[PDB]
Amino acid sequence: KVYNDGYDDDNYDYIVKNGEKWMDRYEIDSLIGKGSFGQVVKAYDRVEQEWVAIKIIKNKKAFLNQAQIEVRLLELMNKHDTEMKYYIVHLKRHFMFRNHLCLVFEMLSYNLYDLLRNTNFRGVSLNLTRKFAQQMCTALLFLATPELSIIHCDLKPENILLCNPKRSAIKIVDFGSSCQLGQRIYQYIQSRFYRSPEVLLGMPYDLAIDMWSLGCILVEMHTGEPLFSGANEVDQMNKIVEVLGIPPAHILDQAPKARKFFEKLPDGTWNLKKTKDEYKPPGTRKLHNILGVETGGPGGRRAGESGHTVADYLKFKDLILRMLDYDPKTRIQPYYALQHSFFK
Ligand SMILES: Nc1cccc(-c2cnc3[nH]cc(-c4cccnc4)c3c2)c1
C-alpha cells in the first residue's frame, strides 16, 4: 500500500508537492523533467538565494548507486573546472532527503531539442551552429584532459541546455550513463540517432564516440531534423551508409557485429545485406547537398542571409565530415577542431 511512509510512489519516485519547503532551505516550485534516474524539480535556495534544479534520485539501490558514480565524476570535474569556463553543468552540493540522493545543480533554460522544436524542426543560423560547436568542442577538449578522460556516452539535443534564454552560452548535462576510459564494460550505449559505427559494430570505443555524436548534432541544429534517424540498429547503419559509404574493409574485418548489417563477398570486399521492407546506394546522399552548400542552405531557406555563402558552408561541411570519420583513431579530436577554419 504505502511505501517509505507514503512519500514514494509505485516507481520509487518521490511525489512532488509544489510549495513544500525542505530543510529550512529549498523551496520547491514544481516538477520539470523525469527519467529513468528519477525526477528533476525547480526549487529556490534561500541560503545562496537563487533558483536551482535539484535532481531527485529514486529511492532504490540500483539508481542510488549509479547516481553516486555521477556525483563522483561531477565533483572530480569541479576540481579542474575553477572558473566555470569549460561548458559543463555545475554540481553545487548534494544531500539526502527522505531516503533520496538529491543533486543540486545550477538552473538553466530549455534544452536544444526545445530550441529545434520552437523553429518547427527547421534549424537555426549557421552563425549560431558555429557558436554551439566551438563551445561543445572545448567542453570535449576538457573531458579529454588525461586525469578526467570522461566519456559522456549520451550527447543529443536533449542533454545540451542554454544558460540564459536570451544568450547562446550552453552547458552539457546527464553524466549518469557516462564512464571513464578503460576496459569495455557495456556494448549497448548512446542514443541510436547519435550512435557511432565503432559501437554499432561492437569494437573498442574511446573518447571519439562523443565526437561522432557532436558531428550528428551540429548538422541537426542547422537542418532541423536528425542526420541519421534509424528505427533499429540495422536501419541506422544503412542510413549512415546512405551518406558516408560502406565503411573501410580493415574496420569491418575486425567488427564482431559486422554481419548484422553487411556480408563479406567471395572477392574480399564487404557489401550491404538486403532487408525485410528502399535506400540509396552507398555514399550518394552527399552532405554537400544535405546541407545545400550551393543551393542557399537547408531547403533553400538561408539564401541571401549573412554568413551563409558557399565559402562558409564549405568550412562547415569540412569539419562535419572530419568529425563523422568512420575511423576512431584518425577522426578529429577537439584541439584540432578549434584550430579548423570554421571558427575564424
Ligand atoms: N525546463 C527545463 C527543460 C529541460 C531541462 C531543464 C533543466 C535545466 N537545468 C538543469 N540543470 C540540471 C538539469 C538536469 C538535466 C538532466 C538531468 N538532471 C538535471 C537541468 C535541466 C529545464
226 and 124 housed in the same domain:
yes
CA distance to 29, 76, 111, 149, per residue, from 176 (Å):
24, 14, 17, 15
Question: Domain containing 57: what range?
Answer: 1-81+89-107
Nearest-angstrom CA–CA distance, 54 and 42 = 7
Secondary structure of 25-59 in the HEC alphabet?
A: CEEEEEEEEECCCEEEEEEEECCCCEEEEEEEECC
Nearest-angstrom CA–CA distance, 3 and 12 = 8
Query: Is 97 marked as a binding-site residue?
Result: no
- Helix 310-323 and helix 208-223, axial crossing angle in degrees, nearest 10: 150
132 and 60 housed in the same domain:
no
105 lines ligand 1 (CB under 6 A): yes
129 and 96 housed in the same domain:
no
Nearest-angstrom CA–CA distance, 341 and 35 = 39
How many domains is the chain built from? 2
Query: Is 38 marked as a binding-site residue?
Result: yes
Choose the residue to mutate in 37, 45, 101, 173 for probing ligand 1, maximizing ligand atoms within 8 Å of C-beta.
173
Note whether 249 and 269 are within 8 A (CB).
yes
Cβ burial, residue 113 (10 Å; 0-12/13-18/19+): middle
159 phi-psi bin (left φ>0, alpha ψ -120 to 50, beta other): alpha
Ligand 1 centroid from CA 269, angstroms: 47
Location of C-alpha cell 510549495:
19
Q: What angle do CA 85, 65, 217 make, to 5 degrees?
A: 45
73 and 134 housed in the same domain:
no
174 lines ligand 1 (CB under 6 A): yes
Note whether 89 and 173 are within 8 A (CB).
yes
Query: Is 104 marked as a binding-site residue?
Result: no
97 and 228 housed in the same domain:
no
Residue 103's CB: how many other CB atoms inside 10 A? 23
233 and 178 housed in the same domain:
yes
152's grid cell: 559522456
CA proximity to 192, closest of 224, 243, 150, 239: 239
Query: Is 215 marked as a binding-site residue?
Result: no
37 and 169 housed in the same domain:
no
Final resolution, Å: 2.9
Cα atoms in the 13 Å half-sphere on the side-chain side of 199 = 24
End-to-end CA distance of the chain: 62
Residue 249's CB: how many other CB atoms inside 10 A? 12
CA proximity to 279, closest of 324, 243, 232: 243
335 lines ligand 1 (CB under 6 A): no
Cβ-based neighbours of 185, under 8 Å, separated by 6 or more: 179
281 phi-psi bin (left φ>0, alpha ψ -120 to 50, beta other): beta
CA proximity to 105, closest of 115, 117, 92: 92
- DSSP state letters, 128-177: HHHHHHHHHHHHHHHHTSTTT-EE-S--SGGGEEESSTTS--EEE---TT
Mapped onto helix, strand or coil, the DSSP state of residue 8 is strand
Query: Is 107 marked as a binding-site residue?
Result: yes
Which residue type, as a one-letter code, is found at position 260?
A: K
53 lines ligand 1 (CB under 6 A): yes
Choose the residue to mutate in 94, 110, 161, 162 for probing ligand 1, maximizing ligand atoms within 8 Å of C-beta.
161
143's grid cell: 573531458
165 and 45 housed in the same domain:
no
Label the pairing between strands 262-264 and 179-180: unpaired
Ligand 1 centroid from CA 146, angstroms: 28
Q: In CATH, what number is assigned to the domain containing residue 307?
A: 1.10.510.10
Cα atoms in the 13 Å half-sphere on the side-chain side of 185 = 8
126 lines ligand 1 (CB under 6 A): no
Positions marked active-site? 154
CA proximity to 14, closest of 50, 49, 52, 54: 54
Which residue type, as a one-letter code, is found at position 41?
A: V
89: enclosing H helix or E strand: none
77 and 136 housed in the same domain:
no
68 and 114 housed in the same domain:
no
102 and 113 housed in the same domain:
no
Label the pairing between strands 270-272 and 38-45: unpaired
340: which DSSP letter?
A: S
Note whether 241 and 282 are within 8 A (CB).
yes
* Residue nearest atom 14 in ligand 1 by C-alpha distance: 173
Instruction: Give the E-state strand segments of the chain in sequence order.
Output: 21-22, 26-34, 38-45, 50-57, 91-96, 101-106, 150-151, 160-162, 170-172, 179-180, 262-264, 270-272
Residue 23's CB: how many other CB atoms inside 10 A? 10
167 and 220 housed in the same domain:
yes
Our measurement of the distance from residue 220's CA atom to the centroid of its chain's CA atoms, rounded to an integer in Å, reads 12
154 lines ligand 1 (CB under 6 A): no
Nearest-angstrom CA–CA distance, 2 and 8 = 8
Mapped onto helix, strand or coil, the DSSP state of residue 308 is coil
